[PDB]
Amino acid sequence: FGDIQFGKYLRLSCDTDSETLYELLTQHWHLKTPNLVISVTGGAK
């Protein structure tokens, strides 16, 4: 758990389900979405 300063990060298992993650990320945190943009890159150093 825990905030980060130099966001609110989280370490989590690969095998958890997305719906309670969504309940966390929308209820305890900010609101919903009219849009969701994904940008895939990360093999580029």
For residue 8, the one-letter residue type is K
List of E strands, the chain: none
Q: What's the distance, CA 21 to chain centroid?
A: 8
For residue 12, the one-letter residue type is L
Within 8 A by CB and 6+ apart from 29, the residues are: 8
Cα 33–38–44 angle (5° rounding)?
Answer: 155
Find the helix or strand (DSSP H, E) in which 22 lies: helix 18-23
Cβ atoms of 32 and 26 closer than 8 Å: yes
Q: What's the rounded Cα separation, in Å, for the pair 16 and 18?
A: 7
This structure's resolution (angstroms)? Answer: 2.5
Q: What's the rounded Cα separation, in Å, for the pair 22 and 27?
A: 8
